[PDB]
Design a protein around this ligand. Structure first.
Ligand SMILES: C[C@]12CCc3c(ccc4cc(O)ccc34)[C@@H]1CCC2=O
Ligand SMILES: C[C@]12CCc3c(ccc4cc(O)ccc34)[C@@H]1CCC2=O
Lengths: 123, 123
């Protein structure tokens, strides 16, 4: 059912674990089948597991890690601070991001929003 | 006008500055007149500067500080990680919070959401 606050801290931390190791099939599986992702926030959202897998396959040398604890509410919502490290066109750089996800009655990410822009890109 | 990413990083950092010193009139002034605040997220929102002032007056020995950089988008939205320290009924404790605000065409906070629950309360 609708995850509890403590359950949310876990799912979201799990998500970063997966993104960090790059297990794409496992990552795509945490989302609801018809989920919508807005990354970065402001851009048109991607919808459904097919498009989400496509996105992650395209994006993931990349390590990620929580930079602070996971803030959670009681209606299945959470937000977390984390850093994404990579190597763009040979050049190494880091991006500071905050993710806001909403889970469904099955513990799957129903909607997710990523907050970040160039001002957070430290290259 | 709609603040730019860099402008958002500033307004939000300014906001924490004010909350940290407790200048209530200055804080209430950053919001639009008909703004809505959801603190914590999930609870019924408070609406308008009168209610917002009431909230802050009630809440603010309290120090606050950004615990990570401010993530910002290009459509006037931002999210930030920060810690709130206080002294509840004689006992000292800290709360980890992440705020998500949306600014209006005047640089005023139009809507604000605070993510946190007991799991972030370290007493
Ligand atoms: C796609 C990307 C790698 C992963 C990633 C980015 C931005 C926000 C994210 C939010 C997530 O929850 C998980 C992964 C990312 C980067 C933008 C530039 C890049 O290489
Ligand atoms: C009201 C409060 C002090 C301030 C505060 C809290 C929670 C989220 C916040 C978010 C803000 O953007 C600014 C101030 C607070 C605390 C909840 C318990 C408490 O004493």
């Amino acid at each position: 059912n609708l995850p509890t606050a403590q359950e949310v801290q876990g799912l979201m931390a799990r998500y970063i674990e997966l993104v960090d190791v790059g297990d794409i099939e496992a990552i795509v599986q945490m989302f609801a089948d018809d989920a919508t992702v807005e990354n970065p926030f402001g851009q048109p959202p991607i919808h459904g597991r097919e498009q989400i897998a496509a996105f992650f396959r395209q994006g993931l040398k990349v390590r990620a890690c929580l930079t602070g604890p996971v803030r959670a509410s009681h209606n299945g919502c959470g937000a977390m601070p984390f850093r994404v490290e990579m190597v763009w066109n040979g050049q190494p750089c880091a991006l500071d991001v905050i993710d806001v996800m909403r889970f469904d009655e099955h513990g799957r990410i129903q909607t997710m929003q990523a907050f970040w822009s160039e001002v957070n890109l430290s290259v």
